[PDB]
Subunit: 60 residues, 6 copies
């Protein structure tokens, strides 16, 4: 399995390291797939590159 | 956060329902973000639409 | 520009044809780019393949 | 609906703010979905990271 | 490396098997990366799910 | 066809230019599609933004 997660910029390296492990376990657990087959890709978004309802996430 | 997970076709609706919840908790837990803000998208791949090392996963 | 839109399954061919044109104009208008350079990809999600807050979009 | 748009780097914050709103309206209008449910993600590409016909968009 | 290719529906399993191998070699060759590290995902688009210049690829 | 390739940061502009051409030929060759219709997008990942088996690609 290959997961790509889009998150807003601002998290520390620790938090992202945890996200990668926790999500990787959840995927492995749920599908009963070997953990080593899981690939996770984090993609950070600038606060002004993410809109919700037509407006920047930053202003809301 | 928005997660998109690519998995091979073949799982039951239950398994995918669990994957969505387990992964959603892991993301919420790891980043300390409200669960309700997590979005997960499952995308199934046909066995002959996924290659590893230049060969179909179906053959490996 | 290349746009990929994820929508829930259930819409008619007409609605999707309109979505593709309307969005294509909006992109061309906003960035002052030639309409012919805009590429749009629609990706439908099964109701049980989309989760919000850890739950299927279908049951909520 | 969740839209991810890939555009070449070089636009101002204003232009991108407009792109996000215009496209968000177009999606909401076309599918008759509540504007607040629309999510847009902008992803900029470096001029040397986008190819057309096997050649950099920068040189063509 | 992880490649995701969007193609129009209509190709045979043979053609897609060739696409996966050929593209996998090209990536491995160009970056001097071990072939076994290359991952390719094929994603088919319905003819009415792909627009060019605001119009279905199907009718044009 | 539209291809998006995720690679780890660290390659030179030459290598990426070659990746774009080689991959563009492979796609055009395999599907018998006009080279000029092929679109390639390169997306670099920071070493600490890519996980394999729950661990950073950098540390393993």
């Amino acid at each position: 399995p290959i997961a790509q997660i889009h998150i807003l910029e601002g998290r520390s390296d620790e938090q992202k390291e945890t996200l990668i492990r926790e999500v990787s376990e959840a995927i492995s657990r749920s599908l009963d797939a070997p953990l080593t087959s899981v690939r996770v890709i984090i993609t950070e978004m600038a606060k002004g590159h993410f809109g919700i309802g037509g407006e920047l996430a930053s202003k809301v």
